Structure formats: C-alpha cells, structure tokens
Chains A and B, each alone.
Chain A
C-alpha cells in the first residue's frame, strides 16, 4: 500500500489519543475508518441529455475510481420517473483511495467552499457514522472551471467502526474534520 500523510497521521497521532481519551482494552476496539461512499443523486439526467458521462468522468477524476450507475426501484408519476431509469451515481472508496480522497477533501476541498463555516456537528448517524453534502464539484482541485458544464453537488457518507457518535466525532475531528460547533 501507498504511504500517505492522513493514514500515517491516523496510525501515529489519532490512535493513541483515542485509546487515552476512551480507555479501550483491545487494539481492534479502537474506532477505525471503514468506508467512504460518494453518491451523486443526480436525477436531472432522466430524460434530456441522459448522457451523464461528464459527471461520471468528474467522479472518476476526483476519486480515481470509476463510479457505477443507480436506477429507480419503482416508477414515480410526479418525478417523471420510469422504473429502471438511470438517475444517479455511486462510488465506494476504501483503503488507500479512501485515505487519498479524504486527504484532498480536508486539505483543499472543504476550504474552497463558498462561505464555509465548518461541517455540521449534528450530521452524525447515531450509530457512529457521518454524512454531508456538496453544492458544487468545482470544490475539488481536480475540477477546473473550464472542463465543467453545469453545477452538480454530491453526497458523502463516511462509515466508521465506532459505535457511538461520541467516539465517531472524536476520530473524525482528530483526523482534521472542521466542525462549526
């Protein structure tokens, strides 16, 4: 595996601080990062130019991983939705790629957000997972203003082995997640 600043920071500075702060008895009992699933809810490309390959290209550039499609589980009248119609994207990032993307997200992305005042503290799962949203894709460094055609945000779900929101917030803020409160 690759040598990364964020993974090394975890194993070096975040592990012992956590063990001290909570008093874990086992090495595995400590909270670890499990996965980070990114999902462009899209749905704007139902009809119109359903060719959403620009958005999937953007995701493949930001994550270094080609996303997959998501389709409708049912047809919906008001949403102009036919069952089985491609309406979104979802890429599951784990391990080294997860660390890479989280590094670039914490060091570049979250700063470049318009009127950024921190991440919402109450956005925790209750089981020890966190979620957030993004209004644009220009936030990430791999996306410039020329190669973009339309603004399209995304959803980020970070899944942690922690059991309470307390341990999860500890791990995430220690890793460098900026919380507004």
Chain B
C-alpha cells in the first residue's frame, strides 16, 4: 500500500453496509470499483461499490 495504491471498502448497494476491505490503484483504475460480493445481511449476492475507507 502506498499513496497511489489505496485501501478501500466495498458497500452492498442494497443495505449500505460495508462488508469487504481491499485495495486498488487509483491511477490505474480511476473509477469506483463495482463487483458482485456475497452480502450476509442480505444473505445473497449483491453488487458492492467502492467506498472511501
């Protein structure tokens, strides 16, 4: 981890609860990370979005 390679959280788009922590390169990937992770509050898969840590 550095200044260009940041750490971030992932938010379930449906219940707005952060569930995962990861890292990206904000220069190589200047868009918000959208993925499909397993949300356990919703107990189903959901598109999680990048959230400032």
Whether A and B touch (Cβ < 8 Å) is answered with: no
Chain A interfacial positions (CB closer than 8 Å to B): none
